From a paper:
Here, we present the structural and functional elucidation of CPR-C4, a hypothetical protein from the genome of a thermophilic Candidate Phyla Radiation organism, identified through metagenomic sequencing. The function of CPR-C4 as a cysteine protease was predicted through remote structural similarity to the Homo sapiens vasohibins and subsequently confirmed experimentally with fluorescence-based activity assays. Furthermore, detailed structural and sequence alignment analysis enabled identification of a noncanonical cysteine-histidine-leucine(carbonyl) catalytic triad.
To assess the effect of the non-native His6-tag, crystallization was also subsequently conducted using protein without the tag, resulting in a third crystal form in space group P212121 and improved resolution (2.25 Å), with one dimer per asymmetric unit. However, the absence of other metal cations in the zinc-free crystal structures implies this is not a promiscuous site, and the tetrahedral ligand arrangement is strongly preferable for Zn2+ binding over other transition metal cations or the sodium and potassium present in the buffers used.
Numbering used by the authors:
A (entry chain BBB): -5 to 38, 44 to 216
B (entry chain AAA): -5 to 39, 45 to 215
Write the structure that this text describes.
């Protein structure tokens, strides 16, 4: 199956996890199965729960969802990769878990709205995948700059392998240092100042569509 | 500063158009102003009207919208470019009008739903722009293959300059031959058979959101 580094990394994860947690991760053996699992978790004070906490309470915001996805991907031999989607100060950033199948990038995403969703493994580069989010990242919750497109940059794939898995997989603290390290990593701008002046606000039908909610119900 | 070919093409268009038609096209001097204008046209639920018919009756499906956009782009010196988005037989193709500003591709689009919309001129290649549509091209109107992602290929930019402008700008016929020529042009596949087997259906929240209607 997987390489030496991956099998070693999986072994370190198995030392930290309970039999129940491993039985769950063993079932999530494709990126599609992982997204299906996050679909059963209730979408979200302030928190930054570990994958352990998320599996216990079955509640997650986008980075909590992406860290659990990255864990499940690593348990089946993928790199635990996050990508930050970074907006203007008018909006909140969004995090996904990147994956590759046959040389093509996909993304697992935990969101409550019909935008910034899952991406199939069909995108030839990180850039191409990231640009598939741009048009649907906009102000939908106020008339003030209604429809303004707010995405400005995407991170390099952020490999959680650089940290001891104890520090995030089963942490009882808040992992704000991990969020901060992601936000501080290499990002690539999507626009220059000229391109920003060209931007057209999303239509009323688009802001109405974006406002629909998965949770509750 | 507009080129010789473009000025000549614009001259041919001016011979064919009424003063009212030219007054409209003169106003639509940016891609954004064109999309704003298509927003005031009623979306349709077979026809294949000319830009003349669309300006007269203020009604358009996607290719009628894109042909009017391409005309308005050409009236200000852009190439009148169409891109075909080609689906499985479970769905209908969608056509946009391509444009470039400072080396980056955008797209003008006439649709009734909050998917397959306008694209800002920020995309580094036709491929990159086309791939920005893939995830939001799915079956939302039936439970039969509910949520199936149906996009399979995108055309090369289709330059309408190859035809005598009389043939489409002011045609009174149906332009089924023009639709057929677009569908027959070079297309680039997005998937192979392996990748198609990977595809995941769109969620219920996505199919509900896609179902929303601008018109009536």
């Amino acid at each position: 199956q997987m390489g030496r580094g991956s099998m070693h990394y999986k072994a370190q994860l198995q030392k930290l996890l309970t039999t129940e947690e491993k039985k769950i991760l063993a079932r999530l053996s494709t990126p599609q199965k992982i997204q299906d699992f996050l679909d059963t978790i209730k979408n979200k004070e302030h928190t930054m729960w570990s994958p352990r906490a998320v599996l216990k309470h079955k509640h997650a915001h986008c980075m909590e969802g992406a860290m659990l996805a990255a864990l499940a991907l690593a348990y089946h031999g993928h790199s635990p990769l996050l990508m930050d989607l970074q907006t203007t100060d008018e909006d909140e950033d969004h995090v996904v878990a990147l994956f590759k199948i046959d040389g093509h990038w996909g993304a697992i995403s935990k969101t409550n709205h019909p935008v910034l969703r899952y991406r199939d493994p069909i995108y030839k580069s990180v850039r191409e995948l990231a640009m598939s989010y741009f048009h649907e990242y906009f102000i939908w919750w106020t008339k003030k700059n209604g429809g303004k497109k707010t995405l400005r940059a995407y991170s390099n794939p952020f490999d959680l392998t650089r940290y001891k898995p104890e520090r995030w997989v089963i942490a009882t603290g808040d992992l704000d240092w991990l969020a901060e390290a992601l936000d501080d990593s290499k990002h690539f701008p999507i626009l220059n100042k000229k391109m920003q002046k060209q931007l057209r606000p999303a239509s009323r039908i688009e802001t109405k569509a974006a406002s629909l909610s998965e949770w509750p119900k």
